[PDB]
Amino acid sequence: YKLVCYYTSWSQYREGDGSCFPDALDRFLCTHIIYSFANISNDHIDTWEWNDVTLYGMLNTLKNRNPNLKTLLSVGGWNFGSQRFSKIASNTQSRRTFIKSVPPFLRTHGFDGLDLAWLYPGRRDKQHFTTLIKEMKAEFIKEAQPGKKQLLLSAALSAGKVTIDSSYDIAKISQHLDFISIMTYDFHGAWRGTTGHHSPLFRGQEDASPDRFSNTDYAVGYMLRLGAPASKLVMGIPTFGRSFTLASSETGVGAPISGPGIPGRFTKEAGTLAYYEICDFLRGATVHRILGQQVPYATKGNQWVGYDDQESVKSKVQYLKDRQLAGAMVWALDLDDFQGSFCGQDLRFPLTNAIKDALAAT
Ligand SMILES: *[C@@H]1O[C@H](CO)[C@@H](O[C@@H]2O[C@H](CO)[C@@H](O)[C@H](O)[C@H]2NC(C)=O)[C@H](O)[C@H]1NC(C)=O
């Protein structure tokens, strides 16, 4: 199957062993490595980080020893502002300028395709988003009409029902996109005020869940039913967990919280912990397997973190294989123990490799 992995340019800035550059990625680990994110200035796909061009090369160099490794550049991101993206896609001239600027930029920097990370189209952008995808694929087909291996077009889509209903025309965009990575995580935010695994495989205990849709299973199925071909659907598996600060002695799912979890030493962001940061957290912590959800959560002191580990990701892969999906999508390589020094076993990319093995197994 496909193993789409994201590399986030900003992961380079993390202190010490946290810092991650494309040259630190196992070229054989994934089938597709997506660089995040590229900006859009003057309606042209442009770099984001000062050293993007350098990192671009650093990444694509991984293709030398591995011809089969495809690489995509992801335009969009959360810091992009769906507003700017809305305008660019709304305006017809602006849309063309951008679409046209992509093929060159990709070929110029060694990318095998483009990933649309519009996070996220508004209720008013459903059509614009369909168009943008349709015309972007048009251009990629054109730019390769002569005989070039056509540039790939993918899109990172929300796994949340609400967003899916208001922003995506799954049926349509699924024809034009080569594959869609369904961001099946971040289902439970600190804002809810209770502990909850952010990336459950299934809904789990009926009483214990807030939404009937805040779980991987529902999203995957919802999308399928909405017209997304299973063969074009890549299921997102996070290598990071969402943390919470407990507010009482209760440590189970649905326990009271005072807010996000204490920021991780390297990711410096409340409510988030890279799997490697989690491996340190597990030291002295207690791991609980959430029955029905197939995912673990660890708690220690006033901290609670729901995450994915070797076992859970293996289960998620079975789920997706049993669903006959295109494969798994990982977010992100820099969040996995890419150093292989935090979770012991000296094994680099424990989670992602677990996923790889699971996909190749049986
Ligand atoms: C991505 O592109 C946008 C648009 O060109 C950049 O935003 C401009 O930023 C300057 C100063 O930061 C402002 O004076 C302009 O008015 C902005 N233009 C727009 C359209 O908002 C943005 O800085 C770029 N980001 C990166 C990382 O390249």
UniProtKB/Swiss-Prot annotation:
Tissue distribution: Present in activated macrophages, articular chondrocytes, synovial cells as well as in liver. Very low or undetectable expression in non-inflammatory colon. Undetectable in muscle tissues, lung, pancreas, mononuclear cells, or fibroblasts.
Biological processes annotated in GO: activation of NF-kappaB-inducing kinase activity; apoptotic process; carbohydrate metabolic process; cartilage development; cellular response to tumor necrosis factor; chitin catabolic process; inflammatory response; lung development
Coiled-coil regions listed in the entry: none
PTM per Swiss-Prot/TrEMBL: Glycosylated.
Key word Cell membrane present: no
Keyword terms, alphabetized: Antimicrobial, Apoptosis, Asthma, Cytoplasm, Disulfide bond, Endoplasmic reticulum, Glycoprotein, Inflammatory response, Lectin, Schizophrenia, Secreted, Signal
Gene3D superfamilies, A to Z: 3.10.50.10, Glycosidases
Residues in GH18 domain copies: 1-362
InterPro entries on file: Chitinase_II/V-like_cat, Chitinase_insertion_sf, Glyco_hydro18_cat, Glycoside_hydrolase_SF, Glycosyl_Hydrlase_18
Assembly with partners or alone: Monomer.
Functional description taken from the UniProt entry: Carbohydrate-binding lectin with a preference for chitin. Has no chitinase activity. May play a role in tissue remodeling and in the capacity of cells to respond to and cope with changes in their environment. Plays a role in T-helper cell type 2 (Th2) inflammatory response and IL-13-induced inflammation, regulating allergen sensitization, inflammatory cell apoptosis, dendritic cell accumulation and M2 macrophage differentiation. Facilitates invasion of pathogenic enteric bacteria into colonic mucosa and lymphoid organs.
Disease implication from the record: Asthma-related traits 7: Asthma-related traits include clinical symptoms of asthma, such as coughing, wheezing, dyspnea, bronchial hyperresponsiveness as assessed by methacholine challenge test, serum IgE levels, atopy and atopic dermatitis.
Descriptive protein name: Chitinase-3-like protein 1
Source organism: Homo sapiens
